[PDB]
Design a binder for this molecule. Sequence first.
Ligand SMILES: [Mn+2]
Length: 412
Amino acid sequence: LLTSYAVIFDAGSSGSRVHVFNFDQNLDLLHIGNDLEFTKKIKPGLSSYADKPEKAAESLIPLLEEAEDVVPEELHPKTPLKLGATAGLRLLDGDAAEKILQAVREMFRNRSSLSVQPDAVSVIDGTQEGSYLWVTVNYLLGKLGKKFTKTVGVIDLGGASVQMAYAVSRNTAKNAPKPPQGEDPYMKKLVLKGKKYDLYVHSYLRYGNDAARVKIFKTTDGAASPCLLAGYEDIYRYSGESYNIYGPTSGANFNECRDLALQILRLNEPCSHENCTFGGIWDGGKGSGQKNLVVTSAFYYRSSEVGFVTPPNSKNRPLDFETAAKQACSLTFEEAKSTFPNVEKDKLPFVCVDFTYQYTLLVDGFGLDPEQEITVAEGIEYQDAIVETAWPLGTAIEAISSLPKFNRLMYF
Ligand SMILES: [Mn+2]
């Protein structure tokens, strides 16, 4: 049987992450050491070098060298290498994101020993990003090739954007409205293990967790934020901008903080085609494709640090996020430090604002039922190993499914 490794970089908003996978001729994963995935990451991301694109590309070299050392030397020249940048670069002002990508593909050309195609490096669309992760989760859960009603939908809360993506009926596809704005179309048509799927996919730029914070902080810009704790003041920098932020002397307030999160969503935008989520964006119908959700990335990190989410994934309910928020916003900054010792020091001030936003996004934003069961994940146990629940596996499956004489497990 023909074999192939794939190296896939996810250039996210707050970090860059290389994934290395290995596949047989059927697009079934193969081991690398004890594992089914090798991945490492670095912070900060590409967007943090908006002024110095050459240095953005150099930041990735450690990762590239690590991944090359993993793929056997004789196999380098025929091993695809891809990089997909997401909402971080999507928020840059334009000349700058292309200048970064140019440096990256020069570096790949000048320094990689792997296979670099003319499409290797790009800022991928939100819809592809949603879709790739959908593939990732449903592959890993073996729900792939089944009727759309037996597949799992996904919500990816990255730092700068959030994607919703779930499978949908020929019917809801046929009648999907034209997108508004400014906005990518709602449907993506793909074939996965011999069956055609019609994915609803939307990406909401600036509604990622970190970007959402900023929207919240701006609604009190002269003043104290109800989402922040007593004792706490600093300048918060995000996407080229500084904000002077601080908690009230009387302390955080869950309800007031909740109001700001709802306000940021613009839930009362005109909705040109019902039913909407927020900002006049069509929900895609909310059929059986979406009854079961796997929820990832920032829904995982802080939750697992305070401990109510469990590795590599766990069953939860949206209200789990409301109860964590109430708990976090009941505390001073000093108290938050001692009570939540596993939260990263530079994330700790935002526990109140993060959880109340996570909650109100799931429930008010996406209309989820506070008591409905969801799964929260960094990974899914696949055979004897854990493979990460992020978009790049989907992209690796696309790339290798197109090698000559390989199974076209996915495309389009
Ligand atoms: Mn991401």
